[PDB]
């Protein structure tokens, strides 16, 4: 009988990438937490 065993390691940070430009989606990431969107009312027809 043999007490067969193993070991474990770790890994460093992820490799490089090319994050998107200052698109519309960054506005979501830049707005504070707890602020819901305010879309216009349905059927709104101004002048």
């Amino acid at each position: 009988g043999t007490p067969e065993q193993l070991q474990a390691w770790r890994w460093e940070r992820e490799i490089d990438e090319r994050n998107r430009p200052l698109s519309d989606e960054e506005l979501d990431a830049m707005f504070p937490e707890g602020y819901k969107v305010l879309p216009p009312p349905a059927g709104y027809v101004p002048i």
Partner: protein, 87 residues
């Protein structure tokens, strides 16, 4: 060096507003902020500690700064509003 030039880099298209009424609809907000031109996007506080204040986003930085000044000290429903920039 720190000179003086208009359209400062400390300002963004995102304008923070304080002292907003607790009861208001999108109908009013689009009529108020749309008075100066097109509006990019708006959000409003929904938590007990956020309600009463909001940040508006304009399509340009030019039109944003133009109205930023003219909306300072504006009185609505017998209360004055306050304008600040995104830091």
């Amino acid at each position: 060096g720190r000179a003086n030039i208009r359209l400062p880099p400390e300002v963004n298209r995102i304008l923070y507003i304080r002292n907003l009424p607790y009861k208001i609809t999108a109908e009013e907000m689009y009529d108020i902020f749309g008075k100066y031109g097109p509006i990019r996007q708006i959000r409003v506080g929904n938590t007990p500690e956020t309600r009463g204040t909001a940040y508006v986003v304009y399509e340009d930085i030019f039109d944003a700064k133009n109205a930023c000044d003219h909306l300072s000290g504006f009185n609505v429903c017998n209360r004055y509003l306050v304008v600040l920039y995104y830091n």
